[PDB]
């Protein structure tokens, strides 16, 4: 209990457009807020949208903190990290554009994160996927990554230190953890944990809700 710090990424506005009268960002916010394991939520957002979350500070059973977004995703994660409790045992990074994440699946990835040191929710890739070389020729089990991405703070800090001191290039595919020798566990999630951005995605969310 109270061992997990959530970093909620909401500074990328697609994540504020409403879902049944509630801005998309608030759905996972509340999901995390109700979990006894969660000590605090560090919201990473433009100071302008701070009010959206601030209104509920008294009603929620977690600590609320704020951090400023960075240039790209890893910078926003670093910003959030600077704000987490000194004693938290787990960092739970979540894309707020993912509103329908189930409590049971968050529980699963937290458990796997605590056990392994790093865990991410994923589902088997439904599409037929092939590796293709530079000559556009096919190179003769694949999983789609979701969020939360759960990592012990010491490991995350070491990962940032490794990238900075060596000047390593970070992309969405080649993230901080890809450079570490520490294992990353894939917790099996639900296909309903979609990223809601396009109008096509938003009508699906209502059906799931």
Ligand X SMILES: Oc1c(Br)cc(Br)cc1-c1[nH]c(Br)c(Br)c1Br
100 touches which of K ion, ligand X, a copy of itself, none (CB within 5 to 8 A by kind)? Answer: K ion
Q: Does residue number 101 form part of the binding site for K ion (CB under 5 A)?
A: yes
Residue with tokens 């894939």: 186
From residue 16, alpha-carbon distances to 46, 66, 82, 105, 209 in Å are 12, 17, 24, 23, 17
Q: How far is the CB of 145 from ligand X (least distance, A)?
A: 5
From K ion, a copy of itself, ligand X, none, which one binds at residue 149 (CB under 5 to 8 Å depending on kind)? ligand X
**Cβ contact 70:78 at 8 Å:** yes
Among the candidate windows 43-51, 83-91, 147-155, 181-189, which touches K ion by CB under 5 A?
A: 181-189
Choose, by CB under 8 A, the member of 48, 128, 167, 169 that binds a copy of itself.
128
- When asked if residue 194 is in the footprint of ligand X (CB under 6 A), the reply is no
Rounded to an integer, what distance in angstroms lies between the CA atom of residue 67 and that of residue 202? 27
Based on C-alpha coordinates, what's the Rg of the chain?
17
CA distance 54 to 157: 28
**Is residue 193 a contact residue for ligand X (CB under 6 A)?**
no
- Note whether 96 and 161 are within 8 A (CB): no
List 46, 54, 55, 61, residue binding K ion (CB under 5 A): 61
Interface contacts to a copy of itself, rule CB under 8 A: 120, 122, 125, 127-132, 136-138, 140-145, 172-173, 177-178, 183-188, 200, 203-204, 207
């Amino acid at each position: 209990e109270k061992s997990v710090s959530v970093i909620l990424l909401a500074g990328g506005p697609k994540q504020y457009i409403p879902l049944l009268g509630q801005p998309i960002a608030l759905y996972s916010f509340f999901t995390f807020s109700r979990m006894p394991e969660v000590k605090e939520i560090v919201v990473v957002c433009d100071p302008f949208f701070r009010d959206i979350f601030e209104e509920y500070e008294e009603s929620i059973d977690v600590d609320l903190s704020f951090a400023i977004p960075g240039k790209e995703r890893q910078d926003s994660v670093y910003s959030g990290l600077q704000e987490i409790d000194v004693n938290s045992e787990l960092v739970c990074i979540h894309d707020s554009a993912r509103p329908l994440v189930n409590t049971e699946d968050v529980e699963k990835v937290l458990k796997d994160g605590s056990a392994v040191g790093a865990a991410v929710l994923g589902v088997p890739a439904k599409a037929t996927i092939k590796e293709v070389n530079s000559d556009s020729l096919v190179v003769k089990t694949l999983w789609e990554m979701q969020t939360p991405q759960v990592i012990k703070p010491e490991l995350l800090k070491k990962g940032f230190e490794l990238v900075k001191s060596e000047g390593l290039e970070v992309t969405d595919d080649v993230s901080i953890v890809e450079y570490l020798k520490h294992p990353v566990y894939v917790s099996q999630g639900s296909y309903t944990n979609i990223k809601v951005t396009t109008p096509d995605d938003l009508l699906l969310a209502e059906r799931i809700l």
